[PDB]
Design a protein around this nucleic acid. Structure first.
Ligand SMILES: [Mg+2]
Ligand SMILES: [Mg+2]
Ligand SMILES: [Mg+2]
Ligand SMILES: [Mg+2]
Ligand SMILES: [Mg+2]
Ligand SMILES: [Mg+2]
Ligand SMILES: [Mg+2]
Ligand SMILES: [Mg+2]
Ligand SMILES: [Mg+2]
Ligand SMILES: [Mg+2]
Ligand SMILES: [Mg+2]
Ligand SMILES: [Mg+2]
Ligand SMILES: [Mg+2]
Ligand SMILES: [Mg+2]
Ligand SMILES: [Mg+2]
Ligand SMILES: [Mg+2]
Ligand SMILES: [Mg+2]
Ligand SMILES: [Mg+2]
Ligand SMILES: [Mg+2]
Ligand SMILES: [Mg+2]
Ligand SMILES: [Mg+2]
Ligand SMILES: [Mg+2]
Ligand SMILES: [Mg+2]
Ligand SMILES: [Mg+2]
Ligand SMILES: [Mg+2]
Lengths: 145, 153, 47, 102, 116, 49, 112
RNA sequence: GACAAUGGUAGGAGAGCGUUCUAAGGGCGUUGAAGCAUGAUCGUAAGGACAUGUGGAGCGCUUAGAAGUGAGAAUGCCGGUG
RNA sequence: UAACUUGGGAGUCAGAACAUGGGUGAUAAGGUCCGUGUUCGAAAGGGAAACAGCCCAGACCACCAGCUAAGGUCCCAAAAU
RNA sequence: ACCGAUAGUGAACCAGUACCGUGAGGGAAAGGUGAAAAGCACCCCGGAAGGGGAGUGAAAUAGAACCUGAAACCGUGUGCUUACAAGUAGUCAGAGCCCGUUAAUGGGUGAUGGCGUGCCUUUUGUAGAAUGAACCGGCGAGUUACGAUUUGAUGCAAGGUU
């Protein structure tokens, strides 16, 4: 009816970032990373199309948990077969496949609609190294809030 | 009631799996039976005898008090000539709807003017109220004009 | 053992889509002016 | 060039020279009607202000005081049996702004 | 004088079907079910025209607060200072300034910050 | 007075309502009876007194 | 031109010659009789009788060349159905609908 | 210009459109009537129009009467088609 | 801002949950039975994850306008890391 | 101010007939070429049925299932759109591509986001796993006579009335 800037594809730019996964305790990081992916700090936010911009997290082993939940916060998974809850991953999952530790815990922050699961693919987590996306010119953002 | 047939009860009841239908000539069949038809009746009421004259003295006073009345003297012709009356209607000019009135009878005026569209020939004791406001022009003989006040007043 | 629902005009047409017939071989004889069926012999062909 | 005016109760952005829809304002077709309530007369050098900024938004001429497209309200309550429907057409007075006075 | 329903019906149902186009499948071709779907479509239309006024001043709150903290101001401290600044502007404008033309909004954030 | 423009008396012809002819008359589906019971059935009515 | 030829009451069902008729549209009309001659369906000669009877209207009537035509459209509408009975069990009958079908092909050179 | 009031079932109270026929007045109709299909138009509702096709002969409009007057449900009735 | 007298037209006589005073029950029930209030029935919205009966509040219609109530302010999801 | 073929008699049509019953007795459906038969001579594919030309006719898109031909429903190429998706089927935002109107804040299609459990009866209460409807047409439920009491109307007035 009136005017309101409804940004579009071929009207939006997308850039990149790098976050170091230092001693922020996985919620303090993986809340603020979710607001980056939804473009929610950029002014040209129109919710019916995908705004936002990519995020690579690099070292992913300096994550901690305060309290004694290093062995609690157990995870679950059901195979659809009977008797098949697999509680075999405690919250100490960092010793093997720690990429799936935070890449779980952004896809819970994002909505699960037919655009959000597209938008969850704009995230990358790497082991401890530098990122193999040197040919993409990332920048640095490291201060999360 | 009065349609033919219907004593049968077609389905039984419980068991068959149709409606609980009763006869063959119930109203919702495509057979007969109409629940609320027109009863042959009569359409006739009446006003009191004072109101029944007050309309009629108001009908022709609608003519005289505004726009239209004419009193002619009497006129006789023995042989029935339609053309000798359509002649007369256009001398003393009237429009297509016109009402002539004889005093009690006319062997010719009742029997002429019976072909022309828009003319009624009524004896002065047969003065109803539809035609006298259906017409637009009273043309009466002078012998009945003295009588209609002597019979309505 | 009955249907619970009339199947609409989408799962009628979507179901019958693997219900077709394909053409057969149709290799022509050398001198028939007539197409025999492959690995067969006609009645009035060059076969 | 760049200003913020208001009428009805709402606020309308000007982009000087354009034509904007707005609701019924009283003087007739084809005449010269102005505004006086500018909350922000920006432009090349923005001059933000008080409840007013003491600068007249210039007179836009008036066109086409007709009525809007018909919308159809229709509500009901579900199983207890009720109905309402009634038509509704809302007036609008478009106008072409021409200049500005800061 | 018996009177039957001669075309008070089919001239009436073909302004429901014609008013109901583009519905899926068999809700645009036939009366007895497609009268229901148009009959909800008004009931939605009365409802959601009270959502455009509950959605667009939920949109503008995002794209102001995305632009307010590009100048070290959170949204909550902003409009407290803006109301003390005596600025009677909407939000829809304060959006449309802050997305087309930053240099206007670049000093508008100062005036609210300078009242505090 | 004349036939083609006759006007009735001044508050004397009121037209009678057909009952049970639509939900938007004020007499819909049940036409003034109620829901169930003795009065609502066809032909029912207690003797007076 | 566009010559056509129909047959207006054929005894078979529509859904059963909808199979073979939706297999020869848009082909060379010369060999198009031979596809119909080399199946084994129900009315594979009955369509073939009509399609021979449409080429033979493209000669005496319209003088189009019988070199090689092309079939733009072929379809079969529902015909006037016949309705019968058959008794099965416990006194109840069940209807049998012996359907009928129109048939309609068009044949043309394509060029105007 | 004010000033207040307007959720709503059973139910009570007003103002209304449309269908068939008659009475009166006034019209349109082979230079194409009623119905039928299509359309982005008009009225606050029921509804009213106007062009364009198909249609081959009888219809509207104002006033006023009389009623076999309005359809989505009755395991409704009948005829069609899945 | 109601009240009462008269005269036409009815509908209801299957209620429910909360908050409190009580009997019965076992200081058992979404139990039953009385008092007394509210809401639903006959009331749509906002909060209580969804949820007739609890918490705010009563919809004549339009608009891409502002304040506020109950509940909230890291993300899904408007607002204080 | 009675009906115009589901109405009117059951029966407009070689009706109490087909048809069902051992019997007494039940008891249907089914109207319309045109002004006139002028009812398609002849040519062609096919065994024929049908069909394309020609021809009569104002009209055969009026061909003897015959005026008008609506809906369910089964089909034909098409402009937009669909194979990482959770759905009472819409509504409100809104991109891209195609078309140009009873010229108006234009029509069709919709990648993606909010919002959301059909309808009627019955209930203290229903999306309800309570009932009812396969769908589209047509038919189908406060009527009349006679009275009694009430307001509204209109004559006349200690009188009114057949
Ligand atoms: Mg009907
Ligand atoms: Mg009511
Ligand atoms: Mg109803
Ligand atoms: Mg009762
Ligand atoms: Mg009932
Ligand atoms: Mg009861
Ligand atoms: Mg009884
Ligand atoms: Mg009300
Ligand atoms: Mg009433
Ligand atoms: Mg008629
Ligand atoms: Mg029905
Ligand atoms: Mg059954
Ligand atoms: Mg208790
Ligand atoms: Mg109590
Ligand atoms: Mg209340
Ligand atoms: Mg909720
Ligand atoms: Mg959510
Ligand atoms: Mg007929
Ligand atoms: Mg016979
Ligand atoms: Mg000729
Ligand atoms: Mg059709
Ligand atoms: Mg779910
Ligand atoms: Mg109740
Ligand atoms: Mg179910
Ligand atoms: Mg059922």
């Amino acid at each position: 009816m009136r005017q309101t800037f409804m940004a579009n594809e071929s009207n939006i730019e997308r850039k990149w970032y790098v976050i170091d996964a230092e001693g922020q305790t996985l919620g303090r990081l993986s809340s603020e990373v979710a607001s980056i992916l939804r473009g929610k700090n950029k002014v040209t936010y129109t919710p019916h199309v995908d705004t936002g911009d990519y995020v690579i997290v690099i070292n992913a082993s300096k994550i901690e948990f305060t309290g004694n939940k290093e062995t609690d916060k157990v995870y679950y998974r059901h195979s659809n077969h009977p008797g098949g809850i697999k509680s075999i991953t405690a919250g100490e999952l960092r010793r093997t496949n720690p990429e799936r530790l935070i890449e779980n815990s952004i896809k819970g922050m994002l909505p699960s609609t037919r655009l959000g699961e597209k938008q969850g693919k704009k995230l990358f987590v790497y082991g401890g190294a530098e990122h193999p996306h040197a040919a993409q010119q990332p920048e640095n953002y490291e201060l999360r809030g | 009631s009065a349609v033919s047939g219907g004593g049968r009860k077609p389905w039984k009841q419980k068991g068959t799996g149709r409606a609980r239908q009763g006869t063959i000539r119930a109203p919702q069949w495509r057979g007969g039976g109409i629940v609320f038809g027109p009863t042959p009746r009569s359409y006739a009421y009446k006003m009191p005898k004072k109101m029944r004259r007050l309309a009629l003295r108001s009908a022709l006073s609608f003519k005289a008090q505004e726009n239209g009345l004419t009193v002619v003297d009497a006129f006789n012709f023995e042989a029935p000539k339609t053309k000798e009356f359509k002649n007369v209607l256009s001398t003393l000019e009237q429009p297509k709807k016109v009402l002539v009135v004889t005093e009690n009878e006319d062997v010719n005026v009742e029997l002429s003017a019976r072909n022309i569209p828009g003319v009624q020939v009524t004896t002065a004791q047969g003065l109803n109220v539809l035609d006298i406001t259906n017409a637009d022009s009273l043309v009466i003989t002078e012998a009945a004009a003295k009588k209609v006040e002597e019979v309505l007043g | 053992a009955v249907p619970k629902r009339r199947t609409s005009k989408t799962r009628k047409n979507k179901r019958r889509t693997h219900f077709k017939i394909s053409v057969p071989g149709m290799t022509e004889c050398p001198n028939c002016g007539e197409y025999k069926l492959s690995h067969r012999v006609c009645k009035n062909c060059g076969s | 060039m760049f200003a913020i005016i208001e009428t009805g109760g709402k606020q309308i952005k000007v982009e000087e020279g354009q034509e904007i829809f707005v609701e019924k304002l009283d003087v007739n077709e084809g005449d010269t009607f102005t505004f006086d309530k500018v909350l922000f007369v920006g432009g090349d050098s923005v001059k933000v202000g008080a409840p007013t900024v003491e600068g007249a938004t210039v007179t836009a001429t008036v066109n086409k005081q007709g009525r809007g497209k018909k919308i159809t309200v229709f509500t009901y309550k579900r199983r207890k049996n009720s109905k309402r429907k009634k038509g509704h057409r809302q007036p609008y007075t478009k106008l072409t702004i021409d200049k500005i006075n800061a | 004088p018996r009177v039957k329903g001669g075309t008070v019906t089919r001239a009436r149902r073909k302004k429901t079907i014609k008013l109901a186009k583009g519905y899926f499948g068999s809700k645009h071709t036939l009366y007895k079910v497609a009268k229901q779907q148009v009959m909800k479509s008004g009931q939605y239309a009365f409802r959601d025209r009270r959502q455009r006024k509950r959605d667009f001043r939920k949109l503008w709150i995002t794209r102001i607060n995305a632009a307010a903290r590009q100048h070290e101001m959170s949204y909550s401290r902003l409009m407290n200072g803006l109301k003390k600044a005596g600025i009677d502007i909407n939000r829809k404008m304060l959006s449309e300034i802050a997305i087309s033309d930053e240099k206007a909004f670049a000093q508008l954030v100062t005036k609210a910050k300078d009242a505090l | 007075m004349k036939l083609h423009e006759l006007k009735p008396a001044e508050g004397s012809r009121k037209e009678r309502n057909r009952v049970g002819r639509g939900v938007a008359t004020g007499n819909g589906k049940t036409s003034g009876r109620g829901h169930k019971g003795q009065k609502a059935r066809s032909g029912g009515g207690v003797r007076p007194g | 031109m566009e010559a056509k030829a129909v047959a207006r009451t054929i005894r078979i069902a529509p859904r059963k010659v909808r199979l073979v008729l939706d297999l020869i549209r848009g082909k060379n009309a010369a060999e198009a009789i031979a596809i119909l001659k080399l199946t084994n369906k129900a009315s594979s000669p009955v369509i073939e009788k009509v399609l021979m009877s449409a080429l033979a209207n493209a000669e005496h009537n319209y003088d189009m060349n019988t070199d090689e035509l092309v079939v733009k459209e072929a379809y079969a509408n529902e015909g006037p159905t016949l309705k019968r009975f058959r008794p099965r069990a416990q006194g109840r009958a069940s209807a049998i609908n012996k359907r009928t079908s129109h048939i309609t092909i068009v044949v043309s050179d394509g060029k105007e």
